[PDB]
Amino acid sequence: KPNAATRDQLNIIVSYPPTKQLTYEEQDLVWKFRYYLTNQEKALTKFLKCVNWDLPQEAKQALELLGKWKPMDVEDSLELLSSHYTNPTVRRYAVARLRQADDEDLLMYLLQLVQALKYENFDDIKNGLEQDLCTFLISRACKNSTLANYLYWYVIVECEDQDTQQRDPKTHEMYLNVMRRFSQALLKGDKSVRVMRSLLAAQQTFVDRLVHLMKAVQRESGNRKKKNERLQALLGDNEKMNLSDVELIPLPLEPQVKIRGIIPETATLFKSALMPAQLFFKTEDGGKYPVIFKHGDDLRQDQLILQIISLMDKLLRKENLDLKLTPYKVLATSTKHGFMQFIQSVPVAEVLDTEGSIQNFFRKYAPSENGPNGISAEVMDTYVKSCAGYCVITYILGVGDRHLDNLLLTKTGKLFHIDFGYILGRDPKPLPPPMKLNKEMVEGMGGTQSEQYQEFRKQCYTAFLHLRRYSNLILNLFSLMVDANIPDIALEPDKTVKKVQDKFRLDLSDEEAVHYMQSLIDESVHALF
Numbered sequence: 001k002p003n004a005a006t007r008d009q010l011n012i013i014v015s016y017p018p019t020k021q022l023t024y025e026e027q028d029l030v031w032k033f034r035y036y037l038t039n040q041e042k043a044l045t046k047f048l049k050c051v052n053w054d055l056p057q058e059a060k061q062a063l064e065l066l067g068k069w070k071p072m073d074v075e076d077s078l079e080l081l082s083s084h085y086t087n088p089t090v091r092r093y094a095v096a097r098l099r100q101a102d103d104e105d106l107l108m109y110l111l112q113l114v115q116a117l118k119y120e121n122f123d124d125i126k127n128g129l130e131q132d133l134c135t136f137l138i139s140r141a142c143k144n145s146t147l148a149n150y151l152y153w154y155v156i157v158e159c160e161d162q163d164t165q166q167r168d169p170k171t172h173e174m175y176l177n178v179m180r181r182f183s184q185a186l187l188k189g190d191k192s193v194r195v196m197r198s199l200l201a202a203q204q205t206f207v208d209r210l211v212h213l214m215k216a217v218q219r220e221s222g223n224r225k226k227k228n229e230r231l232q233a234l235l236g237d238n239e240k241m242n243l244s245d246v247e248l249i250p251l252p253l254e255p256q257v258k259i260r261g262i263i264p265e266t267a268t269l270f271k272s273a274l275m276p277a278q279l280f281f282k283t284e285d286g287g288k289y290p291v292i293f294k295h296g297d298d299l300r301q302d303q304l305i306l307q308i309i310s311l312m313d314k315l316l317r318k319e320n321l322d323l324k325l326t327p328y329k330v331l332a333t334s335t336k337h338g339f340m341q342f343i344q345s346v347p348v349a350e351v352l353d354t355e356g357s358i359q360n361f362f363r364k365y366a367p368s369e370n371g372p373n374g375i376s377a378e379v380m381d382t383y384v385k386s387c388a389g390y391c392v393i394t395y396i397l398g399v400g401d402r403h404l405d406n407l408l409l410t411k412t413g414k415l416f417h418i419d420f421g422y423i424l425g426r427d428p429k430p431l432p433p434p435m436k437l438n439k440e441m442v443e444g445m446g447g448t449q450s451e452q453y454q455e456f457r458k459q460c461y462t463a464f465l466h467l468r469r470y471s472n473l474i475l476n477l478f479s480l481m482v483d484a485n486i487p488d489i490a491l492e493p494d495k496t497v498k499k500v501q502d503k504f505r506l507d508l509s510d511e512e513a514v515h516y517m518q519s520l521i522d523e524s525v526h527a528l529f
């Protein structure tokens with residue numbers, strides 16, 4: 001029906017990022033050829049964006065075409081749950097597509113889907129005390145204990161958000177109703193589901209006791225040594241505090257791991273202003289699981305970034321690219337406390353203080369006579385890959401405040417980033433560079449003169465092209481976060497998705513994007529020396 005020139009225009013429009021606004025002329029064109037476009041699943045979101053949903057006759061025809069359209073890919077349906085859509089049939093269609101996702105994929109989107117409840121019908125959620133989003137999420141949680149664990153903690157954090165309670169009371173009451181609905185469904189279910197309900201309650205009381213313990217340690221006004229002694233003494237009094245030995249419960253941070261308590265003798269406070277605790281949990285497997293427990297601290301921005309880093313890692317692995325990344329787990333248990341999975345590591349700043357160079361560090365703990373610069377080839381391969389992964393990922397996410405205390409290294413060669421208080425282009429100092437590499441980091445692989453430097457560049461190109469291909473998904477997930485209580489998002493909600501979108505350079509072809517990434521890396525490295 002449309003000629004070659006029109007098809008080229010339509011294909012450009014269909015390729016747009018999910019939050020790019022269509023012009024009036026593009027809306028006219030998509031509508032004109034709506035019947036031709038029903039055979040392209042990628043065109044459906046563009047068509048739905050061109051409908052005037054406030055005109056009953058047009059909404060009706062649009063819903064007729066929706067039923068005849070080649071169904072969109074499951075992950076594309078996240079766009080239909082954003083704030084743009086109030087039409088109930090559109091939003092139920094999105095849930096119907098999401099019902100086809102497996103539990104592993106749904107978990108990767110769950111943080112954002114909980115935010116998307118803000119765009120649902122609050123009366124329907126309350127009156128539940130065909131599937132809408134609330135009903136769907138609860139239904140899937142009732143069948144999967146991992147989903148139930150994260151749904152519980154994600155929602156309870158929303159219930160405790162005093163900002164929401166003060167500034168958006170109806171939204172706060174909705175989340176209360178979601179929790180009530182969730183508890184309703186769990187109690188109504190069979191034995192395995194009612195057991196799940198009791199285990200969530202047990203986790204909550206454990207966290208409550210841990211919070212009370214942290215406060216007791218901080219009413220102390222002794223030095224750090226005295227506070228470590230207080231922390232260990234309180235943890236050791238199980239009759240008083242009940243944290244050294246408890247009946248088995250899922251670890252909120254990673255519920256597949258059941259824990260029996262916390263080891264009292266090895267608990268210490270970090271030497272930092274907020275004095276978070278390092279705690280070793282006794283696992284059911286008879287092992288130990290170290291965490292950081294932060295108290296008096298909002299972990300939600302870190303929680304989001306580590307969730308997105310975990311997604312990006314899984315997407316790269318899906319494309320058979322394992323860049324040896326460290327997406328450590330982060331879970332907020334309230335707006336003021338939460339857990340982080342502790343990875344044995346050393347900050348690069350400490351490596352330079354004690355060994356002088358990343359290379360000296362690798363030569364000490366991973367020597368190899370015939371290896372690159374006397375270092376194990378496997379360790380160097382792991383180093384190059386992880387540098388590349390984090391270079392591309394922190395560039396896309398605009399991570400700031402990149403000093404050598406936030407760059408961590410393992411003896412197996414993994415480099416990874418921590419502490420994501422500055423994202424989306426924010427930085428303590430002005431005019432941060434678009435790509436934040438460290439001189440010590442290039443030096444760690446042998447300098448620009450090493451063959452490792454070209455291996456690093458090559459892995460950046462590959463990772464960048466792979467993540468570009470999932471830009472629709474990544475951008476849709478940020479679009480669902482724009483109203484969230486996340487500091488660097490709430491600063492400029494209407495600009496948030498574009499800040500990520502621009503990093504993908506979707507205006508460039510693959511070959512042009514590789515050229516651009518090459519120039520960006522080289523320019524950043526050149527500026528360092």
Ligand SMILES: C[C@@H]1COCCN1c1cc2n(n1)[C@@H]1CCC[C@@H]1NC2=O
Pocket residue numbers: 270272276292302328340341342343344345408418419420
């Ligand atoms: C848990 C991860 C991964 O394992 C190594 C340690 N990592 C982190 C993360 C943070 N830190 N260390 C520092 C130390 C105390 C708080 C500060 N802030 C962070 O965000």
Ligand code: NA
Pocket residue numbers: 123
């Ligand atoms: Na009402």
Ligand code: NA
Pocket residue numbers: 268269270271278
């Ligand atoms: Na410590």
Ligand code: NA
Pocket residue numbers: 214215218274275276294295296
């Ligand atoms: Na504390």
Ligand code: NA
Pocket residue numbers: 325326327328
């Ligand atoms: Na890991």
